[model samples]
Target: QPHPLEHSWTFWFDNPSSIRPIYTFSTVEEFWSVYNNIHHPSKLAMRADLYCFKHKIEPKWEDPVCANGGKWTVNFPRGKSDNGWLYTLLAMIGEQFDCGDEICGAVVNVRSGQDKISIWTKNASNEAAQASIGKQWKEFLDYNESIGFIFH
Candidate 1:
């Protein structure tokens, strides 16, 4: 039997040249199928990014649902970002956040020296919601460094 996710999500690919949809998944089974065949972020080009957001929200700053939002980002050295990326995806799909409704989605950006993964949320001004979200996310990764938020 297929386990239904609370919401469907679309995966997006972006580089300087263009941003495009890769796939949309609405079940755990489907997500695994898509994810297992996809290239890991460690192998992506320096400028590439992969985004997974709830269906309909664009991964851009200007999107209607995103315009007032912001992100919680963590920078990782090369070879160190894949685990975090995987965790974020599983957490989102698992509906693991206490403030899950506040979450928009997450993105993994490949860059020179450091790769980054960021989780976007709906309200830049919801300090309480973001604080709890940050605490739980940090605990999930067992990360020691302080993580911060940047509003769009």
Candidate 2:
């Protein structure tokens, strides 16, 4: 049995070759099943996006729910690829961001030296919500070492 969270979440896959558009699910069991069945992060091709959002929010920048939102990012060296993806995924599925509900989804961009991990919020101009989410994300990742965000 898997532990449950407050909301039902969806897991999306947008890699170039995927025959499907995106995927979503509502239970911890379903979530894990999808995760367990997929290729590990390091094995994915370039430009692939694994997004997890609240049951129905589309993971798009222009989506009405995401238009005003921005992402809080953490850059992990691709050399440390495995650990980086592990932490980011833990943060997302663990629902660790302060405004977890406000979180639209997350993206992991695989690159050579510097990979990027981003957490998207539903409202960027809402400084209070953004800041709170940022703080919580940093705390959750135990990112005292080094981490930051950008809203654009």
Candidate 3:
């Protein structure tokens, strides 16, 4: 029972062996397949990141979408199960915001102890759109977690 998104997005994963360039995606289904087959973020041996972005946009500073965009981030305490990762993914793929259309993508980063989920958006100056996305995302988390936004 997977919910669908208005625009198809790409999902990418970063393995420790990822000595190459950053990974990117163009479709959400492929992202789901990889996610379904791999261990959840809470179980990974090493850190991994899942990124979903627009069809033609790369998920990097060099990419135009990210060049002038900013991110709203939610951080999960070290070893807090997976309250953060799953919620973030659902927000992205579930289109859980009034401005989901403005969403460039989402990312989950696994580290020594910290797990982070971030939502990316284009246009730092779009305050209305940004706030709408942020509030809705906060509502989605609904777990009394703190998230900060940085608009570049």
Q: What is the lDDT ranking, best to worst? A: 1, 3, 2
Local distance difference test scores for all models: 0.88, 0.68, 0.70
Q: Candidate 3, residues 22-115: lDDT per residue as tens digits? A: 3343345655666677666677645777666655566765687675787998887655637666677667766667777788877777778787
- Which parts of model 1 are misplaced by more than 4 Å? none
Which 10 successive residues of model 2 have the least lDDT summed?
17-26
Q: lDDT tens string, model 1, 38-106?
A: 988898888898999999888775586675687899989986899999999999999999998999989
| Candidate 2: clashing pairs of residues | 68-124
lDDT of 1: 0.88
Question: Please, what is the TM-score per model?
Answer: 0.94, 0.78, 0.78
Off by over 4 Å in 3: 1-4, 18-32, 45-47, 81-83
Predicted structure with the largest TM-score when compared to the true one: 1
Candidate 2 on 53-120: residue-level lDDT in tens?
A: 66666665437667456878887655455565666667767777667777876766666566677778
Q: Candidate 1: minimum summed lDDT over ten consecutive residues — where?
A: 59-68
* Global lDDT of model 2: 0.68
Pick the lDDT winner: 1
